[model samples]
Target: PPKKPKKPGAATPEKLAAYEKELAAYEKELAAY
Candidate 1:
């Protein structure tokens, strides 16, 4: 079986943007509630 690679300790810019986008979506849901 092939070994899976581990994620780096640091967050990449793309990941950071994705995280922020997800957070924004969560916040919007809260606002709608």
Candidate 2:
């Protein structure tokens, strides 16, 4: 079985921007494949 966890409430705009950057990089890599 797979389980997911929730993120903490300590998220901020700066952190979210970094997370978006990471997601963009992931998508870019996937596209390359």
List CA RMSD, all candidates: 10.2, 5.7
Off by over 4 Å in 2: 1-9
Per-residue error for 9 in candidate 2, Å, reads 5.5
Among the numbered candidates, top TM-score falls to: 1
How accurate locally, in lDDT, is each candidate?
0.62, 0.61
Off by over 4 Å in 1: 1-9
- Tens-digit lDDT string for candidate 2 (1-33): 222233336799876777777667667776776
At residue 32, candidate 2 shows an lDDT of: 72
Tens digits of per-residue lDDT for model 1, 4-28: 2333357898876776776676677
